[PDB]
Amino acid sequence: YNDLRDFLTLLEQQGELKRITLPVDPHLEITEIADRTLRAGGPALLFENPKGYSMPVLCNLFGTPKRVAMGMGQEDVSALREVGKLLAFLKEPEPPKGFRDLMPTKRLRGAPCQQKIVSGDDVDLNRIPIMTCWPEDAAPLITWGLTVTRGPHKERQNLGIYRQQLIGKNKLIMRWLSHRGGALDYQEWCAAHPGERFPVSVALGADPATILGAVTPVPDTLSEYAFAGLLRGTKTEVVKCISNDLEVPASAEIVLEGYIEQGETAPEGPYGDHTGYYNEVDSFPVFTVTHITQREDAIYHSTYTGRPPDEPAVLGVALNEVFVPILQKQFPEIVDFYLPPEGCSYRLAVVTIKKQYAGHAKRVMMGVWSFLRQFMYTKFVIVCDDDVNARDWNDVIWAITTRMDPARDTVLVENTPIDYLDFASPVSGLGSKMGLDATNKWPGETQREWGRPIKKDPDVVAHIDAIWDELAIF
Amino acid sequence: YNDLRDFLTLLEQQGELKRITLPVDPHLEITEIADRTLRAGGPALLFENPKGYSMPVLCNLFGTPKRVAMGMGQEDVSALREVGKLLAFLKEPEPPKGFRDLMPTKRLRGAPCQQKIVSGDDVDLNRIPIMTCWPEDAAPLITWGLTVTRGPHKERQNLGIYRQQLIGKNKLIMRWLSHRGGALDYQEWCAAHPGERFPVSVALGADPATILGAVTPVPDTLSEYAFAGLLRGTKTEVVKCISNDLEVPASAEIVLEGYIEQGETAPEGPYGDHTGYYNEVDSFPVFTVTHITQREDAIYHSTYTGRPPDEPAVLGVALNEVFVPILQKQFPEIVDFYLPPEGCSYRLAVVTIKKQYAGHAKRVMMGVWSFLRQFMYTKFVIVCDDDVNARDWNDVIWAITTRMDPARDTVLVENTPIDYLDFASPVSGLGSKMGLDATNKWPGETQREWGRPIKKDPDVVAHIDAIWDELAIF
């Protein structure tokens, strides 16, 4: 509720947390245990005996949709929809001047995240149990922790999740993939104040809300921290940094302050990410840590990415539950909107609508590839009717195979924008998308007598639904 | 401002209104005069000497974007954008219950629209100067006038623009093309109270706001009349009908009350519409007028449809100016969004964006065919950069021809939903769309050195801009 600690005591009570006092190595061993754990439901893991470190390593926190929901003050995967409704409403708060005639950040003075402090001369990052994920990974990599930066002229600050490679006792690599967020504030600062070092701060182990707030996309009409307030219920308590004016959550577990030396870059050695493949070496800015501030008995929050199901993959499933309502408000025909993890969290989407006229499927298609920005890179879209479970491959494959004619019902559009790292494309940043509607064809779409689908009896599915537990089948 | 009369006195002062006291026939003669008039700017026309009628015929009211703007209490085509901003904001008024803890219709008792009244026995529609538009038209056809209906269970009422054919001294044809609006309230009433007559009322010559409100699409989170209030500035004054509970604007010029006899239908003889072609005969419900109420010295508001530029065509150009901001809020890359009349008000759209990455053009493409419902039938979309005037065919054709490779830069998608009346399609209600992006190609989209476009000097275009009037060239 207020900070991570409280979230873990809550989870531990609800059996959602497990403590591995046994000796475990943060060098690819924690991943293995976490992987198996996440691959089977599993609670959040808290290793308090990392081989060679004093900081317990906390991972797989949002390894279940349930826990993701809870982290947003909802305690119900379904409730996420309410968060979608909110997000929509936040976009248009006030009307234009023409017809207009008709949650602040609580800054504290002291903060537990500044209980212990070390700077410059002695800021050994080697003391932190930063973990290595896969055997061919370059080096230890910070995976969580929200990076905080500020523009050269905008008062508002941004929270970003960028993985950080350990290249020195006090140097990390700042991998700002996007052309927005922290990456924008930097290329902008370089303009306004060329040569002068760019201030940067990373907060590890903040309250679930500030974390999830940084994850969920929010309208520019609201500050990241602000959103966290609505989710949490109360205003988020931040605190001034030491070497800069940036603001980091006061309850954070560990906070890294430093800067980015204009021009200083470094090759981000190979790393395996959500796709399940290793990223090829690339150059990126290097973060210089001049200050490490933490709590007493602070725990290190960390995660990993690999072939899905992934820690982030599940976070995305939980996060897609919030977009559904935002998507429906736009296309009331949409019943369910789902993006299976196997499809790398965003590469494929299944949409089930209530078809009300021939050709309808194509509209939802274009809709998905254009409406929200988080679905511009998905290259596969399957449109189905409301009598199929978008989340059950048996239902979807049935639809594809019974109510579809490949050549006739497939829509291929070329030269669309695509993820720069999607090696499977013909050219970096440019590829094709495929839409396949498997909706019942209406007269016009077909000249044949369509099949009468088997529809279960509501009362029966309801009766055995109650007697089910009495039938000790499992 | 308050009623039509006031709008005409305003226009007549501003030279936007002309009175044709000369004898003119409402049988296709008024159209001819109006057509030429509209085809050259021209003011609204008010024929006060229709051959064989006592009611002056008022047409071509919104024959100019200027006048459309004015009719919305803006007096500026640009201001329409503010109306778009408003429309967007009206969609999401209040937040969900979860995080919630943090313009009525002035009904009068009397009304000028009920100053003169006739019913049943004597409700001759032949007294009204209903005009015939084209030589092959079936019969006189009411073209304006908002049809008011109410659902069998929803308190809210709808305003609709449906053309009405004169089939009797007191029978009109109710052409509810859509599957919504009045057409929905009828097929719904038939369910709730089968056999019982469906109440219907048509108001001719209402205040420009109520008219334009009925035209512009508004979110179901607001009543048609309500919207008119914001536009007008003051709440719209409505008044109870005589033979039903429907509410019509009290300042209306003429009001037709009656019902629709379940099952009673009639073939809507051929008529030429916006496309510039004659519609083929079709069956539709028949409106029985049991009551005709009007003002003293009431004028008949009427219009027509034919090959564009059309009275409605211009209304649409003015109405598209409001969607631009609603479109931009969604795709900030969109600079200008225009739909030329020649393309039948909606069949073609030109979009100019600020391309920020390869393949971008395709996104705005899908965006147009899916975002708003008023652009689902457009089958042609041209995407251009911000250095071209979307409203100047010279600029657009230049773009198409210089920065595009037909096969490479054209996107064809088949079996999309299309207007049931678009005879040019392979099958009714089903057709294909073509997207052609003529945006500068970026590396990846091409392997050739793209051309450096000629860009005018801002200061020069600015200098001759001032000295222009001094240069008596025209």
PDB file of N, CA, C and O in Angstrom, chain B residues 357-396:
ATOM      1  N   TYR B 357       8.803   8.409 -39.223  1.00  0.00           N
ATOM      2  CA  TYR B 357       9.438   7.103 -39.344  1.00  0.00           C
ATOM      3  C   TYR B 357       8.862   6.345 -40.524  1.00  0.00           C
ATOM      4  O   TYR B 357       7.703   6.551 -40.883  1.00  0.00           O
ATOM      5  N   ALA B 358       9.670   5.468 -41.121  1.00  0.00           N
ATOM      6  CA  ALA B 358       9.227   4.693 -42.275  1.00  0.00           C
ATOM      7  C   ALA B 358       7.958   3.913 -41.995  1.00  0.00           C
ATOM      8  O   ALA B 358       7.774   3.401 -40.894  1.00  0.00           O
ATOM      9  N   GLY B 359       7.088   3.844 -42.999  1.00  0.00           N
ATOM     10  CA  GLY B 359       5.841   3.113 -42.871  1.00  0.00           C
ATOM     11  C   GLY B 359       4.733   3.870 -42.168  1.00  0.00           C
ATOM     12  O   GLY B 359       3.608   3.404 -42.089  1.00  0.00           O
ATOM     13  N   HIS B 360       5.050   5.048 -41.661  1.00  0.00           N
ATOM     14  CA  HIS B 360       4.088   5.874 -40.946  1.00  0.00           C
ATOM     15  C   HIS B 360       2.766   6.103 -41.694  1.00  0.00           C
ATOM     16  O   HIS B 360       1.684   6.056 -41.097  1.00  0.00           O
ATOM     17  N   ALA B 361       2.862   6.366 -42.997  1.00  0.00           N
ATOM     18  CA  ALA B 361       1.683   6.631 -43.820  1.00  0.00           C
ATOM     19  C   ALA B 361       0.596   5.576 -43.678  1.00  0.00           C
ATOM     20  O   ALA B 361      -0.597   5.888 -43.671  1.00  0.00           O
ATOM     21  N   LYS B 362       1.002   4.322 -43.564  1.00  0.00           N
ATOM     22  CA  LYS B 362       0.029   3.260 -43.429  1.00  0.00           C
ATOM     23  C   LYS B 362      -0.775   3.373 -42.143  1.00  0.00           C
ATOM     24  O   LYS B 362      -1.943   3.001 -42.117  1.00  0.00           O
ATOM     25  N   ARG B 363      -0.180   3.907 -41.082  1.00  0.00           N
ATOM     26  CA  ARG B 363      -0.904   4.013 -39.815  1.00  0.00           C
ATOM     27  C   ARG B 363      -2.069   4.995 -39.893  1.00  0.00           C
ATOM     28  O   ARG B 363      -3.177   4.705 -39.440  1.00  0.00           O
ATOM     29  N   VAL B 364      -1.810   6.158 -40.474  1.00  0.00           N
ATOM     30  CA  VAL B 364      -2.841   7.178 -40.614  1.00  0.00           C
ATOM     31  C   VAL B 364      -3.923   6.610 -41.524  1.00  0.00           C
ATOM     32  O   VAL B 364      -5.102   6.925 -41.387  1.00  0.00           O
ATOM     33  N   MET B 365      -3.508   5.753 -42.449  1.00  0.00           N
ATOM     34  CA  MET B 365      -4.428   5.118 -43.386  1.00  0.00           C
ATOM     35  C   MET B 365      -5.462   4.310 -42.629  1.00  0.00           C
ATOM     36  O   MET B 365      -6.658   4.579 -42.720  1.00  0.00           O
ATOM     37  N   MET B 366      -4.986   3.307 -41.895  1.00  0.00           N
ATOM     38  CA  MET B 366      -5.845   2.447 -41.086  1.00  0.00           C
ATOM     39  C   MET B 366      -6.654   3.355 -40.157  1.00  0.00           C
ATOM     40  O   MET B 366      -7.838   3.125 -39.906  1.00  0.00           O
ATOM     41  N   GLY B 367      -5.976   4.381 -39.639  1.00  0.00           N
ATOM     42  CA  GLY B 367      -6.587   5.328 -38.725  1.00  0.00           C
ATOM     43  C   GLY B 367      -7.841   5.942 -39.284  1.00  0.00           C
ATOM     44  O   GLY B 367      -8.870   5.974 -38.618  1.00  0.00           O
ATOM     45  N   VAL B 368      -7.758   6.428 -40.512  1.00  0.00           N
ATOM     46  CA  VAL B 368      -8.906   7.028 -41.150  1.00  0.00           C
ATOM     47  C   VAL B 368     -10.053   6.036 -41.350  1.00  0.00           C
ATOM     48  O   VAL B 368     -11.197   6.355 -41.044  1.00  0.00           O
ATOM     49  N   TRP B 369      -9.759   4.832 -41.829  1.00  0.00           N
ATOM     50  CA  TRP B 369     -10.810   3.833 -42.059  1.00  0.00           C
ATOM     51  C   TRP B 369     -11.387   3.174 -40.808  1.00  0.00           C
ATOM     52  O   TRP B 369     -12.273   2.319 -40.913  1.00  0.00           O
ATOM     53  N   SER B 370     -10.909   3.561 -39.630  1.00  0.00           N
ATOM     54  CA  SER B 370     -11.400   2.924 -38.414  1.00  0.00           C
ATOM     55  C   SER B 370     -11.786   3.835 -37.257  1.00  0.00           C
ATOM     56  O   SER B 370     -12.774   3.582 -36.557  1.00  0.00           O
ATOM     57  N   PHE B 371     -11.014   4.893 -37.057  1.00  0.00           N
ATOM     58  CA  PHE B 371     -11.270   5.790 -35.946  1.00  0.00           C
ATOM     59  C   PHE B 371     -12.718   6.256 -35.819  1.00  0.00           C
ATOM     60  O   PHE B 371     -13.451   5.770 -34.956  1.00  0.00           O
ATOM     61  N   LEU B 372     -13.126   7.200 -36.665  1.00  0.00           N
ATOM     62  CA  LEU B 372     -14.495   7.727 -36.635  1.00  0.00           C
ATOM     63  C   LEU B 372     -15.390   6.945 -37.590  1.00  0.00           C
ATOM     64  O   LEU B 372     -14.916   6.419 -38.590  1.00  0.00           O
ATOM     65  N   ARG B 373     -16.680   6.877 -37.278  1.00  0.00           N
ATOM     66  CA  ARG B 373     -17.639   6.146 -38.098  1.00  0.00           C
ATOM     67  C   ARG B 373     -17.996   6.869 -39.394  1.00  0.00           C
ATOM     68  O   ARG B 373     -18.474   6.243 -40.338  1.00  0.00           O
ATOM     69  N   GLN B 374     -17.763   8.181 -39.441  1.00  0.00           N
ATOM     70  CA  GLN B 374     -18.074   8.975 -40.631  1.00  0.00           C
ATOM     71  C   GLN B 374     -17.032   8.843 -41.746  1.00  0.00           C
ATOM     72  O   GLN B 374     -17.113   9.515 -42.774  1.00  0.00           O
ATOM     73  N   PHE B 375     -16.065   7.959 -41.552  1.00  0.00           N
ATOM     74  CA  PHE B 375     -15.035   7.765 -42.551  1.00  0.00           C
ATOM     75  C   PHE B 375     -14.792   6.279 -42.803  1.00  0.00           C
ATOM     76  O   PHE B 375     -13.702   5.873 -43.203  1.00  0.00           O
ATOM     77  N   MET B 376     -15.806   5.460 -42.561  1.00  0.00           N
ATOM     78  CA  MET B 376     -15.646   4.028 -42.767  1.00  0.00           C
ATOM     79  C   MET B 376     -15.969   3.659 -44.206  1.00  0.00           C
ATOM     80  O   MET B 376     -15.560   2.608 -44.695  1.00  0.00           O
ATOM     81  N   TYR B 377     -16.705   4.530 -44.884  1.00  0.00           N
ATOM     82  CA  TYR B 377     -17.084   4.275 -46.265  1.00  0.00           C
ATOM     83  C   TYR B 377     -16.178   4.956 -47.289  1.00  0.00           C
ATOM     84  O   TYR B 377     -16.309   4.717 -48.488  1.00  0.00           O
ATOM     85  N   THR B 378     -15.270   5.817 -46.849  1.00  0.00           N
ATOM     86  CA  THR B 378     -14.404   6.455 -47.827  1.00  0.00           C
ATOM     87  C   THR B 378     -13.471   5.380 -48.389  1.00  0.00           C
ATOM     88  O   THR B 378     -12.826   4.643 -47.644  1.00  0.00           O
ATOM     89  N   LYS B 379     -13.432   5.270 -49.713  1.00  0.00           N
ATOM     90  CA  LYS B 379     -12.626   4.249 -50.361  1.00  0.00           C
ATOM     91  C   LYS B 379     -11.329   4.747 -50.966  1.00  0.00           C
ATOM     92  O   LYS B 379     -10.629   3.988 -51.618  1.00  0.00           O
ATOM     93  N   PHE B 380     -11.005   6.011 -50.736  1.00  0.00           N
ATOM     94  CA  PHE B 380      -9.776   6.584 -51.251  1.00  0.00           C
ATOM     95  C   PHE B 380      -9.104   7.458 -50.202  1.00  0.00           C
ATOM     96  O   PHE B 380      -9.724   8.382 -49.672  1.00  0.00           O
ATOM     97  N   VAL B 381      -7.839   7.175 -49.900  1.00  0.00           N
ATOM     98  CA  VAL B 381      -7.099   7.979 -48.933  1.00  0.00           C
ATOM     99  C   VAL B 381      -5.694   8.252 -49.443  1.00  0.00           C
ATOM    100  O   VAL B 381      -4.952   7.334 -49.790  1.00  0.00           O
ATOM    101  N   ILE B 382      -5.341   9.528 -49.480  1.00  0.00           N
ATOM    102  CA  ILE B 382      -4.026   9.951 -49.923  1.00  0.00           C
ATOM    103  C   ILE B 382      -3.274  10.540 -48.732  1.00  0.00           C
ATOM    104  O   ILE B 382      -3.741  11.487 -48.094  1.00  0.00           O
ATOM    105  N   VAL B 383      -2.111   9.980 -48.424  1.00  0.00           N
ATOM    106  CA  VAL B 383      -1.326  10.496 -47.321  1.00  0.00           C
ATOM    107  C   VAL B 383      -0.129  11.269 -47.841  1.00  0.00           C
ATOM    108  O   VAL B 383       0.663  10.758 -48.642  1.00  0.00           O
ATOM    109  N   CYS B 384      -0.005  12.507 -47.362  1.00  0.00           N
ATOM    110  CA  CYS B 384       1.069  13.419 -47.763  1.00  0.00           C
ATOM    111  C   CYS B 384       1.782  14.071 -46.587  1.00  0.00           C
ATOM    112  O   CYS B 384       1.329  13.982 -45.453  1.00  0.00           O
ATOM    113  N   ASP B 385       2.904  14.728 -46.866  1.00  0.00           N
ATOM    114  CA  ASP B 385       3.664  15.413 -45.821  1.00  0.00           C
ATOM    115  C   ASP B 385       3.104  16.810 -45.602  1.00  0.00           C
ATOM    116  O   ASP B 385       2.214  17.240 -46.328  1.00  0.00           O
ATOM    117  N   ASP B 386       3.653  17.524 -44.620  1.00  0.00           N
ATOM    118  CA  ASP B 386       3.189  18.869 -44.288  1.00  0.00           C
ATOM    119  C   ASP B 386       3.603  19.981 -45.246  1.00  0.00           C
ATOM    120  O   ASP B 386       3.269  21.137 -45.012  1.00  0.00           O
ATOM    121  N   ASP B 387       4.311  19.642 -46.321  1.00  0.00           N
ATOM    122  CA  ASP B 387       4.745  20.644 -47.292  1.00  0.00           C
ATOM    123  C   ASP B 387       3.829  20.650 -48.508  1.00  0.00           C
ATOM    124  O   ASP B 387       4.209  21.097 -49.588  1.00  0.00           O
ATOM    125  N   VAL B 388       2.615  20.148 -48.326  1.00  0.00           N
ATOM    126  CA  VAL B 388       1.640  20.102 -49.405  1.00  0.00           C
ATOM    127  C   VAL B 388       0.288  20.533 -48.866  1.00  0.00           C
ATOM    128  O   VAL B 388      -0.072  20.216 -47.734  1.00  0.00           O
ATOM    129  N   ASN B 389      -0.453  21.272 -49.677  1.00  0.00           N
ATOM    130  CA  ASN B 389      -1.763  21.736 -49.267  1.00  0.00           C
ATOM    131  C   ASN B 389      -2.806  20.681 -49.606  1.00  0.00           C
ATOM    132  O   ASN B 389      -3.114  20.442 -50.770  1.00  0.00           O
ATOM    133  N   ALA B 390      -3.339  20.044 -48.572  1.00  0.00           N
ATOM    134  CA  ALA B 390      -4.328  19.003 -48.751  1.00  0.00           C
ATOM    135  C   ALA B 390      -5.552  19.516 -49.482  1.00  0.00           C
ATOM    136  O   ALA B 390      -6.296  18.735 -50.070  1.00  0.00           O
ATOM    137  N   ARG B 391      -5.760  20.827 -49.458  1.00  0.00           N
ATOM    138  CA  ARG B 391      -6.924  21.392 -50.119  1.00  0.00           C
ATOM    139  C   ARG B 391      -6.632  21.974 -51.488  1.00  0.00           C
ATOM    140  O   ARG B 391      -7.475  22.665 -52.051  1.00  0.00           O
ATOM    141  N   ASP B 392      -5.446  21.704 -52.026  1.00  0.00           N
ATOM    142  CA  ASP B 392      -5.089  22.198 -53.353  1.00  0.00           C
ATOM    143  C   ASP B 392      -4.657  21.040 -54.248  1.00  0.00           C
ATOM    144  O   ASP B 392      -3.543  20.525 -54.108  1.00  0.00           O
ATOM    145  N   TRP B 393      -5.535  20.636 -55.171  1.00  0.00           N
ATOM    146  CA  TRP B 393      -5.233  19.524 -56.076  1.00  0.00           C
ATOM    147  C   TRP B 393      -3.902  19.670 -56.787  1.00  0.00           C
ATOM    148  O   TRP B 393      -3.318  18.676 -57.192  1.00  0.00           O
ATOM    149  N   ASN B 394      -3.410  20.891 -56.955  1.00  0.00           N
ATOM    150  CA  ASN B 394      -2.126  21.033 -57.613  1.00  0.00           C
ATOM    151  C   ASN B 394      -1.047  20.438 -56.720  1.00  0.00           C
ATOM    152  O   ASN B 394      -0.159  19.732 -57.192  1.00  0.00           O
ATOM    153  N   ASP B 395      -1.139  20.703 -55.420  1.00  0.00           N
ATOM    154  CA  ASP B 395      -0.166  20.174 -54.466  1.00  0.00           C
ATOM    155  C   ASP B 395      -0.312  18.665 -54.334  1.00  0.00           C
ATOM    156  O   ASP B 395       0.668  17.925 -54.376  1.00  0.00           O
ATOM    157  N   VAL B 396      -1.541  18.203 -54.189  1.00  0.00           N
ATOM    158  CA  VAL B 396      -1.730  16.782 -54.017  1.00  0.00           C
ATOM    159  C   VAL B 396      -1.270  15.988 -55.250  1.00  0.00           C
ATOM    160  O   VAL B 396      -0.503  15.040 -55.113  1.00  0.00           O
TER     161      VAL B 396
END
